[PDB]
Design a protein around this ligand. Structure first.
Ligand code: NA
Ligand code: NA
Ligand code: NA
Ligand SMILES: [Zn+2]
Ligand SMILES: [Zn+2]
Ligand SMILES: [Zn+2]
Ligand SMILES: [Zn+2]
Ligand SMILES: [Zn+2]
Ligand SMILES: [Zn+2]
Lengths: 480, 479, 483
């Protein structure tokens, strides 16, 4: 809740309790650097932050003239000030290019306040409450206002997602996800449907139901369906999300080291809820459907099993060989329900595979699908939004590794290599021909939840997928 | 090899002891399908091969009208006929025309390859020739061009494959050098073969560290091939990991992961084959092939987790795992490569398991800074029939190879991003003035695979050779 | 080194390019807190350091009035100042809960230790501008004589510690057993000590086959060294033998260590290294005792000549040893070196070894284990050692543990038959090689935890700590007091 006040005034004349000045690429020459000697004395060379005490100026380093590094720096700056006693900070303006840099600056600043400290007995309300932005170029009023609108909506949407994903699993049940979705629907006047295991049975979503069987009597599943219907709809978009509120691996039980952080296996479903908040408040011209399959994957005497053969809603049978490959079962059924809506575009988000993380690192999501133009659009837009992405290619050799001797498809690969992609090729088996060129699969298993601070993300949930998909939709609608 | 004869005749008039007919996308309607009824009776629907016994016609299915699937079926067809009694097969011409003809002739030829040297039941094939009727399903010009590529590329691939398949007691660093010597003699190439004393003079201590355990058994070799044509539009350095065996070192591999490590020399072998291909194709570029050859063995002299190595470039390396040895060898070989002032540097290595986990066994990773250069390699490589993907660097991953007691650590602090942090390790040894001239290709996946797939027999594939050849040809076009 | 200058003046009139003031227990009331308002505005509440830029004052928090936290904070202050542009810092004299002498020692040693870091191989490494601390002889709450005594201790102990740390931090390709002998030779030359460096033939003649078995794998690459340093003062009240495990690298042998466990094994020479540093310290402190430093140096490598599970070795002492795991090699080298040590007929024998993983599992990374039979001797080492700033714990033998190192085909086994009590059963194994006439004169110190830690803690930088040197030094001094 960092308020940003835009003011038609010079940086020098603007009034706040302290000052923020960015040092881009180690350039200390600007007028705003009031006491350069002080920096020399204490050897500040532009890496990280430095507080001039006398002048009450916080300097924040930006290693290269780069919009993404500016976003990071702004976040680090406000993180720093949050611990101090200044109620307000003033900052000059740093910079299509102008709009993107103002978005980065304002979003950066606002995300600086976030941390998941709900359970800390020492949590303190920040004194820092406002950033005063002097509308004057470091090197317009229309752009600032637009950027500020984005920053407020995106900050709110990301923090919704981050709060949901960070919520511990005894609390963050499938029912709890549905409640978060209800608030978002009520806030934006959206249509929402919340289906239970009875609906799932009716629609023959037996893959989804299988995953939930261990825990049905404790925490029943929810299929959550949000709809944003605007005045003008240029496209119909289905966003499909894995809402595994806890994943212990089922009977194929995860080792202890790997079960921690599995409250974040609802990262994909949570991003979809945040995406409907963001896309509705931005008022995009598209009918957007947010579909979340929510359940735990627990172990117990009613668990689904290695050797079970499940009949998916689409009709294809699935040999289960490992119950820890559960996200793709839930997704198989949720994608089927999505396709019944006849959307122009389907994007699914999932913390699907460990192999993705092994391949791309913790900070980068994978993009899969058939339509290269579509995959490129999502990548380019996503990269610009500040998310790290990489396309991973299908091939015919990988496709063969998910065959089953006794079912239509196996829920794991016969090889220990290519897991993220064979997982995407599993999902493909349930994408109808007439949707294969309209479909994107985004595996956010890495950056959805990371146990350290990085970029604009505090320890834990990051809200991965939200910015990227928002940018993707906006660019898509520009062509439409 | 498979002799391919180009004849200006109709398919019908051409003569051979059997016929090969491709069935594209289940189209059985063509005149060359002599007896449709037979195929109906025996339920042949165009998947794989089917042999018309009376007419002596082998049908080979191509699932889609696709040049790469054609290359695959052509290989399967010859594999099938290799076990039969026909000395010759005739085939029509299938169709851009150039790539199709290249795919056809290459695929046909590769169908004969099997690593069967140590098999006691091996017989010589009866099949010697494919008669190609120059008739579509000038032409002769394109055909003669595709056949020249096919012959050079088959030869080049089989050089790489025989070398990679050679078991480690035989395929020593010295053995690699001898193979490189042969290629240089056949191609009138300049060649230098340096030993551990040269390494020592050049202060290539990361390289030497990996070899220390086994120095007294099989000494290391730095192999330097040079192709220098009449006209050189570019200077190109090709740099290969030549680990002729990798047991992991003191960080010993589990038994399950040590099998196939004779193929840790896949990158170095690719480079040897590339100089064969690029010299015989007569490309207008000066090409240097640089191969760092050694084993990574375990013993009382092995370099150790906790060793801190001074690279030739001068940066220090904290060793935390002796099974990340390839990047040490390459660190020094890249430094040697850069002294040559090349316009382009590409390295090939079977570098990381994480690459394989990430992309699957059939696909190589492309890393670097220059997007235009990576894109050229990717696009040309895919067209050559190799599977590739670009993997992106980022600033977060770069932090993971930091060391508290050296300039860089030879492993990442994270379990995640292995192939890429290995790429970022290599990057610390690429001078600023070469960072935009550099490609890193991780072929740990497709270099060696324990089954047949596409045009590849069990074992070595020759991965990297086709993709880099196409990359070079495309590159010189723009120069 | 950080030059310390003692000056007879007030803190205020002393001159330096910056000041250091400790803030104890969040009390900001002292006159040396020049601008108290500044600290409030920027929410400095006494945790860690805070720099008053305008006044050039570094505050360093000391959570309680405690001599050990003072030592830690001093170190932090100088670590912080090392990265700045000040050539000199001035500080006053602090007397926390120790006494004046121990507080002076803490302050001066902490300050000096703040400069250490193992950065030899770093390319970015730069010399620090910070060269001196000006100590103004004025109490925060004979002073000069005590300060001179504390300064000498801090000077000798800093030097001794950094010798151990440089040696332990040295990577294994370089830090061979021969390299260990060379460092010992330098120490000997510097201090005019007797030194003997025995090779594998001496080991052979003395029938030290446990020692030799460990070395067999790597004999042809790096021959072993038995290092024997001797400090002989005019007046010696006691003969003290210090015995150290000098495994310059331990890959585990044929019982190969997992990869994640083989890293840091350059530090398996921590015990031997501490003994080398201990002779430097004790000679320069001029202690009144004949001190022997015995170091068994070798690698424990894998190879075709490596000693094996099922090998049965005849120790120098005569007892046969069933080997069931080659990664329990330190106790074999120590069996033979302890035997050698007892041949000196010392009054006290202390061995130091990075001996067991179980010790670390038991006490944590920061604490050493003390074993032996003589409770009073054990207590002297513990108390002395704690006061010196090392963390320590006595671990008790018992008869049930002793049975677990029995062998069906030899006199003793080099591992226990149980997964439990590893550090203690290793100590009981050592005991089998301690003659009856030395059982009440023997201490075994397992420094497997603190000798090497992969982070900064207390006064120790990433890596080697020099664990054991401060503790043993204090123990010898206390011992000689009563003698
Ligand atoms: Na994650
Ligand atoms: Na492979
Ligand atoms: Na330790
Ligand atoms: Zn799972
Ligand atoms: Zn899951
Ligand atoms: Zn390796
Ligand atoms: Zn390797
Ligand atoms: Zn050991
Ligand atoms: Zn040891």
């Amino acid at each position: 809740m960092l308020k940003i006040k835009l003011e038609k005034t010079t940086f020098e004349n603007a009034k706040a309790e302290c000052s923020l000045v960015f040092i881009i690429n180690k350039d200390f020459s600007h007028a705003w650097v009031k006491n350069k000697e002080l920096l020399e004395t204490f050897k500040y060379e532009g890496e990280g932050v430095f507080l001039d005490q006398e002048n009450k100026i916080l300097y924040a380093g930006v290693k290269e003239d780069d919009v993404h590094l500016l976003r990071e720096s702004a976040c680090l700056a406000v993180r720093t000030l949050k611990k101090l006693a200044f109620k307000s900070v003033k900052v000059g303006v740093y910079t299509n290019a102008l709009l993107e840099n103002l978005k980065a600056l304002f979003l950066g600043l606002k995300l600086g306040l976030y941390e998941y400290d709900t359970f800390k007995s020492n949590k303190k309300e920040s004194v820092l409450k406002e950033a005063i932005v002097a509308l004057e170029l470091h090197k317009l009023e229309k752009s600032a206002k637009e950027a500020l609108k984005y920053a407020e909506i995106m900050t709110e949407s990301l923090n919704i997602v981050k709060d949901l994903v960070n919520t511990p699993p005894m609390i963050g049940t499938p029912v709890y996800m549905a409640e978060v979705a209800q608030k978002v629907a009520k806030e934006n006047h959206l249509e929402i449907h919340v289906h239970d295991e009875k609906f799932l049975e009716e629609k023959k979503m037996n893959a989804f139901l299988a995953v939930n069987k261990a825990s049905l009597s404790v925490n029943p599943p929810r299929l959550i369906h949000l709809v944003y219907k605007p005045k003008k709809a240029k496209k119909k978009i289905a966003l499909v999300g894995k809402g595994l509120t806890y994943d212990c691996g089922g009977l194929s039980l995860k080792p202890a080291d790997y079960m921690v952080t599995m409250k974040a296996d609802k990262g994909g479903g949570s991003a979809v809820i945040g995406l409907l908040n963001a896309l509705a408040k931005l008022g995009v011209e598209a009918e957007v459907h947010g579909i979340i399959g929510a359940t735990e994957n627990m172990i117990g005497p009613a668990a689904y099993k290695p050797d079970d053969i499940l009949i998916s809603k689409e009709g294809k049978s699935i040999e289960v060989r490992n119950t820890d490959a559960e996200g793709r079962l839930v997704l198989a059924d949720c994608l089927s329900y999505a396709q019944d809506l006849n959307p122009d575009v389907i994007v699914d988000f999932a913390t699907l595979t460990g192999a993705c993380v092994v391949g791309l690192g913790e900070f980068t999501s994978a993009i899969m699908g058939h339509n290269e133009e579509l995959k490129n659009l999502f990548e380019t837009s996503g990269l610009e939004s500040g998310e790290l992405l990489a396309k991973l290619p299908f091939n015919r050799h990988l496709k063969k590794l998910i065959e089953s001797k006794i079912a239509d498809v196996c829920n794991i690969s016969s090889s220990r290599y290519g897991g993220a992609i064979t997982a995407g090729l599993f999902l493909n088996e349930f994408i109808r021909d007439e949707f294969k060129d309209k479909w994107l699969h985004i595996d956010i298993a890495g950056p959805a939840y990371v146990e350290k601070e990085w970029d604009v993300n505090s320890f834990g949930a990051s809200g991965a997928g939200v910015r990227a998909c928002t940018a993707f939709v906006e660019e898509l609608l520009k062509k439409a």
